């Protein structure tokens, strides 16, 4: 439905060019039709099959048989932490064991992402002069190309920025938590009728209620790699200081949302699941699709309606849904969306946050007329269901500019108000559920099913299994990043080491901006209370006379099998610090360059243990005290 | 209006003819099988299984030696198929229990709402009964799938096994030992063309609740469907047992397909079933023919035709592309009937794409009218008014297979010795439920330090005397493990302390109807629960007193309606840590207090 004249100007007014031309027809079997995006949610084959691949990744990394075998050891270790009454985690409870499994897997992925960001910040600061050169000199090139240049000019250890490259280099602890696999083959619905016998409580303690089963079956975790975050950070940065501020600003928001996601399962209410509505007739002249996204790790949802070639969206609050309607009040409007449309409902799990989903929706709305209907649906469904960035470079650039804007201080959505409000809604819901269950059944039964111990993800006392790949002189080193902290109070860190040898000595060192501590222990199969901290309101800590925001803990042990680090706050429900923004992150600066230094346990001496500063050591050889 | 781009993006794709679409699928099934069952683990555990089988006191000619390669390969195939089938039956029994709890709401749903689709009705029923799985879509079924229900992969089991060991005119003990280590080329070919299919109760509820108006009818339809499925699976294991190479499905396509004159031929050869399907797609016309897999005295693979739907030419010339079906013959016939009725209002691409996707990936078509007709035909083919008399065909398949086993062994016994024939064609591996087999139980429930392993006793497709035993391996040197068998009147608690050795728990007799008398009451199935501290593996063994126990006729809809058995008592548990000596025995529910099934009170 359009032809062009030969020997004419190739320039066009529009900046985003559709693969199918203005005729809106692509001959099948051509290259243009081959590189067209594919609908994943709409196509039953691709949605069915995608779930198979995600299930395989979860099962290969985390095995249900392994988790059930380690339940007894974990229960003993959690009892070894002598916690005040009303604050102990009792893994013999079926419900409490479930939340630990979800919490442990979710925290480990978040913790690993923070570690990768720390090394990335270290590499950027090391090459400040050449990083500032690339940012200032080149501005017309694409954000992806700028990200590739930055990762090349630094020792990023992950040069690829594409989605295929990101999946190629990814640890076992990063793969998202697949909810259905966790809840498989687990007893539901123990009926104990007016029996307070100790045997009756024991069997009831062994099962879970049906509400918890629905929550797990509609749960999927989102963890954003630092390589995907570099594009929004470097799209408008003019200096390395600005770029580092953006990187920390985004991960602070992702930090808050991940904590919020876990609290939804703890509260004791059924979390809604995202769905897509399609017309009943597959071969319909008038085509419309509706997407309702309910991010579990977030506080704001998104409804995207594509009617013909017109795209409209609405952002709604996930709190305050007192009425029968699932959607709360709408915070940002982008047209009129009809959620009463009748059609086939297909359920899906999003792998991108609300910010990333919103960023693409604004970009598509800008290019509503330039792109065809298939391209609009394909790009949107690929990003939502696969976290795959569009091949259209012009569209990709616009998405990342919007991603930066929603994160920066000039965002149309004030996230702190909504994140704070969601926290208040969740705790109020938990209180209402507990008292409602207190009237129906006994107080003992209520504590079984909805525990008051867990609450938030980082408030909860959780364990993080560490993986070690570096061994020096027979001593394998296990890394753990202490901090940052979203809550203030007194916090304790413990380490458990199991190894084949009957007796052994293992060393733990804690790196700050000044120097290490060099603790040495010999106990096995029991937590050791390695180090104890205090956290200010702003999240900073005066560690040995210097304010710190994060520390690096390294554990050295010979012929070890598993090393676990436990964490517990002194008081239950530690109050949360305000989430940092771009201004807060650039206001103060800490040096993490010292975290890569490592010691050799084999050559250690008695005088070396204790708090030592860098001046005491000479250049290199951070193990021997004499300079 | 629309540009038409989105319609082409959601069109079904040919997953058999496309070589890119066949390679990708085969990889995922292989990966899925290896993850759940590892060749290294099974081979390493061979010695432990062999000692367990021998420790069971089996008379001569009725015992199995996994030291033989053929006996070991048959056992792992048998254990994998039985475990998946057994898991489905427990899921079905649980689903029946939830429906019976809420019969009032289920009856209202079945009566008031009839204009909605089959999928919509199933979703409403699952939500009301509060079942563990509440998704009827393909993705939901895949997501909520246990490790044991994964279909077995043929080539993975047959990988890296010695084939074709040649000893010449030697009766020496050492030569016999080396002969037993290898396997015959025929068994390798059979395993390379073997894939199993185990349908989920969620997939069956759509056919069961498409015309039902009462909870009893819905429950009876569910039981009737699963009776057919288990009989078909039993045929599947017997097919590999005899000394015959099984046929495997293929598609014939033109060597140089034309744009406007293209034809497709599908020949489905369900390994679990007595009947096959031939489907031809020429133009917009679909023709099908249902043939009998037994007989085939001639060179042609097809037997006599038992259902006609047109003229299908199986002698067409073209490229041959081979595949394994993930659906039963009933499901394939159900779709091909609906496609034939709706051939006018569907395009060529929809007809091929919908057919190939269902056969290869068990994917139901997205068309709502097509899906409703498919499940209506599925119900008809498994009901008492079916165009196919199944009990006749499954019976005839059994007689044909036993006849082939006798002539294959007798043919070998002439060509080589009796000992050579015995190690190559065992007589102790007749049928899946007839054979002695083991079930590697898994447990995720811990009551006061005791892990619970559940097991379903029955239902029985054979009659005679049966024996059940447990082998418990525990990290502790000394432990006390309990076994509880739950019936309708009450439960029976026993206490044992022996470890790393099979121990018989239950002696049961089952009559012609397939119903046993457990302590003065007729039962069709029982539940066995095992409680162990810090257990590593718990296996349950089953064997029949006589070899090749006679069959029990398959039960249809009216058989299930006539006799009703309560299964609500399978849910309750006991706490062995709080057991007492006086509480250890056979006791009824009126003795116990309400809610505490541990102390007599």
């Amino acid at each position: 439905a359009w032809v062009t004249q030969a020997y004419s100007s190739g320039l066009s007014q529009n900046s985003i060019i559709s693969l199918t031309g203005n005729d809106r027809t692509v001959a099948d079997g051509t290259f243009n039709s081959m590189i067209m995006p594919r609908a994943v949610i709409a196509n039953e084959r691709e949605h069915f099959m995608k779930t198979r691949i995600d299930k395989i990744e979860h099962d290969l990394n985390r095995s249900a048989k392994q988790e059930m075998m380690d339940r007894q050891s974990l229960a003993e270790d959690y009892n070894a932490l002598n916690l005040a009454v009303g604050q102990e985690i009792k893994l013999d409870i079926a419900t409490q064991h479930q939340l630990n499994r979800l919490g442990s897997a979710m925290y480990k992925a978040d913790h690993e992402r923070e570690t990768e960001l720390t090394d990335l910040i270290n590499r950027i600061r090391e090459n400040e002069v050449t990083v500032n050169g690339i940012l200032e000199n080149q501005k017309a090139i694409t954000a992806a190309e700028r990200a590739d240049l930055l990762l090349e000019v630094v020792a990023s250890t992950a040069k690829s920025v594409s989605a295929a490259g990101r999946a190629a280099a990814d640890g076992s602890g990063v793969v998202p938590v697949f909810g259905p696999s966790v809840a498989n083959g687990i007893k539901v619905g123990i009926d104990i009728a007016d029996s307070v016998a100790e045997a009756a409580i024991a069997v009831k303690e062994s099962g879970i209620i049906t509400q918890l089963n629905d929550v797990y079956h509609a749960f999927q975790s989102v963890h954003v790699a630092p390589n995907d975050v570099i594009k929004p950070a470097a799209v408008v940065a003019g200096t390395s200081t600005e770029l580092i501020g953006n990187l920390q600003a985004i991960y602070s928001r992702l930090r808050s949302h991940s904590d919020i996601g876990f609290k939804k399962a703890t509260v004791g209410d059924v979390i809604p699941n995202s769905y897509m509505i399609k017309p009943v007739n597959s071969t319909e002249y008038a085509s419309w699709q509706l997407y309702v996204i309910h991010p579990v790790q977030g506080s704001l949802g998104l409804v995207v309606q594509l009617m013909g070639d017109a795209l409209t969206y609405n952002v709604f609050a996930q709190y305050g849904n007192t009425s029968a309607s699932e959607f709360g009040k709408t915070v940002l409007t982008g047209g009129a969306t009809n959620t009463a449309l009748e059609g086939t409902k297909v359920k899906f799990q999003t792998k991108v946050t609300a910010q990333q989903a919103l960023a693409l929706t604004m970009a598509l709305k800008d290019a509503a007329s330039m792109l065809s209907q298939g391209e609009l649906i394909g790009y949107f469904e690929q990003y939502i269901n696969l976290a795959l960035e569009p091949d259209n470079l012009s569209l990709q650039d616009n998405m990342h500019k919007y991603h930066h804007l929603l994160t920066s201080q000039n965002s149309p959505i004030d996230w702190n108000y909504h994140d704070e409000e969601m926290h208040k809604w969740l705790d109020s819901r938990k209180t209402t559920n507990y008292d409602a269950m207190q009237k129906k059944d006994g107080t003992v039964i209520a504590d079984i099913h909805i525990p008051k111990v867990f609450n938030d993800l980082r408030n909860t006392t959780l364990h993080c299994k560490l993986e070690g790949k570096q061994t020096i002189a027979g001593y394998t080193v296990y890394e753990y990043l202490i901090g940052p902290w979203a809550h203030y109070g007194d916090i304790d860190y413990s380490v458990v080491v199991d190894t084949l040898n009957e007796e052994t000595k293992w060393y733990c060192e804690v790196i700050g901006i000044d120097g290490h501590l060099l603790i040495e222990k010999s106990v096995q199969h029991k937590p050791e209370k390695i180090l104890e901290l205090t956290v200010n309101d702003s999240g900073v800590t005066s560690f040995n006379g210097r304010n710190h925001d994060r520390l690096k803990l390294k554990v050295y042990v010979k012929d070890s099998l598993s090393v676990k680090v436990f964490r517990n706050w002194i008081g239950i429900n530690a109050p949360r610090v305000k989430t940092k923004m771009f201004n807060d992150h650039i206001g103060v600066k800490y040096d993490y360059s010292h975290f890569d230094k490592n010691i050799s346990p084999a050559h250690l001496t008695l005088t070396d243990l204790g708090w030592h500063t860098w001046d005491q050591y000479n250049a290199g050889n951070w193990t021997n005290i004499k300079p | 209006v629309a540009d038409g781009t989105f319609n082409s993006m959601i069109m079904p794709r040919a997953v058999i003819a496309n070589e890119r679409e066949h390679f990708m699928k085969t990889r995922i099934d292989k990966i899925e099988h290896d993850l759940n069952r590892s060749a290294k683990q099974e081979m390493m555990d061979r010695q432990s299984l062999a000692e367990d089988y021998n420790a069971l006191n089996l008379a001569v000619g009725q015992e199995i030696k996994l030291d033989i390669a053929t006996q070991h390969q048959l056992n792992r195939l048998g254990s994998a198929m039985y475990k998946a089938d057994h898991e489905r039956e427990t899921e079905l029994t649980d689903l029946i229990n939830r429906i019976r709890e809420n019969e009032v709401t289920v009856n209202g749903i079945l009566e008031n709402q009839k204009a909605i689709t089959a999928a919509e009705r199933a979703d409403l029923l699952l939500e009301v009964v509060a079942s563990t799985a509440k998704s009827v879509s393909a993705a939901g079924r895949a997501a909520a799938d246990g490790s044991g229900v994964v279909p077995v992969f043929g080539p993975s089991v047959a990988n890296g096994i010695k084939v074709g060991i040649d000893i010449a005119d030697s009766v020496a003990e050492a030569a016999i030992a080396v002969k037993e280590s290898g396997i015959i080329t025929q068994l390798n070919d059979v395993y390379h063309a073997f894939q199993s299919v185990h349908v989920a109760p969620n997939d069956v509820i759509k056919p069961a609740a498409v015309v039902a108006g009462t909870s009893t009818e819905l429950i009876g339809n569910l039981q009737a469907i699963y009776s057919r499925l288990r009989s078909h699976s039993d045929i599947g294991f017997k097919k590999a047992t005899v000394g015959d190479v099984i046929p495997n499905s293929y598609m014939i396509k033109p060597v140089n397909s034309t744009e406007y004159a293209s034809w497709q031929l599908y020949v489905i050869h369900p390994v679990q079933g007595s009947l096959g399907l031939v489907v031809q797609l020429m133009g917009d016309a679909l023709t099908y023919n249902v043939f009998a897999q037994y007989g085939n005295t001639s060179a042609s693979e097809f037997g006599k035709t038992v259902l006609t739907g047109g003229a299908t030419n199986t002698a067409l010339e073209g490229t041959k592309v081979k595949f394994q079906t993930k659906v039963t013959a009933q499901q394939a016939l159900a779709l091909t009937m609906a496609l034939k009725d709706a051939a006018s209002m569907l395009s060529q691409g929809e007809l091929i794409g919908y057919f190939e996707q269902y056969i290869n990936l068990a994917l139901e078509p997205d068309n709502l009218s097509l899906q409703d007709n498919m499940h209506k035909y599925h119900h008809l083919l498994t009901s008492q008014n079916s165009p196919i008399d199944w009990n006749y065909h499954d019976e005839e398949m059994h007689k044909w297979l036993d006849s082939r086993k006798t002539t294959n062994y007798d043919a070998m016994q002439k060509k080589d010795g009796t000992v050579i024939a015995d190690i190559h064609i065992p007589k102790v591996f007749n049928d899946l439920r007839n054979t002695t087999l083991h079930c590697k139980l898994e447990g995720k429930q811990t009551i006061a330090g005791y892990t619970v392993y559940e097991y379903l006793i029955g239902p029985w497709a054979h009659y005679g005397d049966i024996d059940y035993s447990v082998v418990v391996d525990t990290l502790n040197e000394e432990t006390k493990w309990y076994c509880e068998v739950i019936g309708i009147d009450g439960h029976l608690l026993i206490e044992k302390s022996v470890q790393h050795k099979p121990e018989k728990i239950l002696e049961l007799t089952v009559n012609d109807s397939g119903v046993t008398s457990f302590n003065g009451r007729n039962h069709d199935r029982l539940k066995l629960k095992v409680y162990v501290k810090d257990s590593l593996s718990v296996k349950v063994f089953r064997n029949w007193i006589g070899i090749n126990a006679p069959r029990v006729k398959t039960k249809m809809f009216n058989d299930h309606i006539g006799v009703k058995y309560d299964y609500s008592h399978f849910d309750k548990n006991i706490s062995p840590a709080h057991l007492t000596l006086t509480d250890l025995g056979w006791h009824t529910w009126d003795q116990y207090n309400a809610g505490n099934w541990t102390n007599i009170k």
Partner: peptide, 15 residues
């Protein structure tokens, strides 16, 4: 090799 299996294996060998 699991943590529980290692702990019980060591306990069995020592005691």
């Amino acid at each position: 090799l699991s943590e529980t299996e290692l702990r019980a294996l060591k306990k069995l060998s020592t005691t």
